[PDB]
Each structure stands twice: as structure tokens, then as C-alpha cells.
Amino acid sequence: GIDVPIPRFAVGIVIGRNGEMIKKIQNDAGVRIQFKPDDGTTPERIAQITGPPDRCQHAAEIITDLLRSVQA
Ligand SMILES: [Zn+2]
């Protein structure tokens, strides 16, 4: 898969209420998304996207479009 950096203040809207948004991204793109553990201090969190390259790129694009729509 691929690693997408997410600004810390925006992680909430990528995951969504009770993980609804990360479920919708997984469901629409057909991928698995997990956040890498970090020490909590870092300005970005890393979303690890697992799957074939095309699906991973579609999931990365969906996450990008979310972030851009709120200027993250
Ligand atoms: Zn787009």
C-alpha cells in the first residue's frame, strides 16, 4: 500500500464519527486504512493504505479532496 500524511487537527474528519468516514473511504475505494502509532507529539499522523496501487491512489485522492475542502 501507501502512507498518506494527515495534519493532526484534521485526523478527526478523515476517521469521522465512530470511524464512519474511514469506513466509507475503505468501502468506496476497497482498501484497508490504519494510522501508524506515533508518540502523540508529531504535527502529522500517517494513514497506512493497504491494497492494490489503483485503489490506494483513489483512497489517497479521496483523503486529499477532504483535506483540501477544509484547507488542511
Ligand atoms: Zn479529487
Author numbering: 277 to 348
The publication says:
Far upstream element (FUSE) binding protein 1 (FUBP1 or FBP1) is a multifunctional single-stranded DNA- (ssDNA) and RNA-binding protein, which acts as a master regulator of diverse cellular processes including transcription, mRNA stability and translation as well as RNA splicing. Comparison of the four structures showed that they all adopted an evolutionarily conserved eukaryotic KH-domain architecture, consisting of a three-stranded β-sheet packed on one side by three helices.
In addition, we observed also a unique, additional small α′ helix at the N-terminus of KH3. We therefore generated the KH3 mutant harbouring the GKGG motif resembling that of KH2 and KH4, and measured ssDNA binding using ITC. As expected, in contrast to the wild type, all mutants did not show a shift in migration on native gels upon incubation with the selected ssDNA. These overall results suggested therefore that all four KH motifs of FUBP1 interacted with c-Myc FUSE ssDNA independently and individually, and KH1 and 3 might exert potential preference for ‘TTTGTGTT’ sequence while KH2 and KH4 might have broader binding specificity.
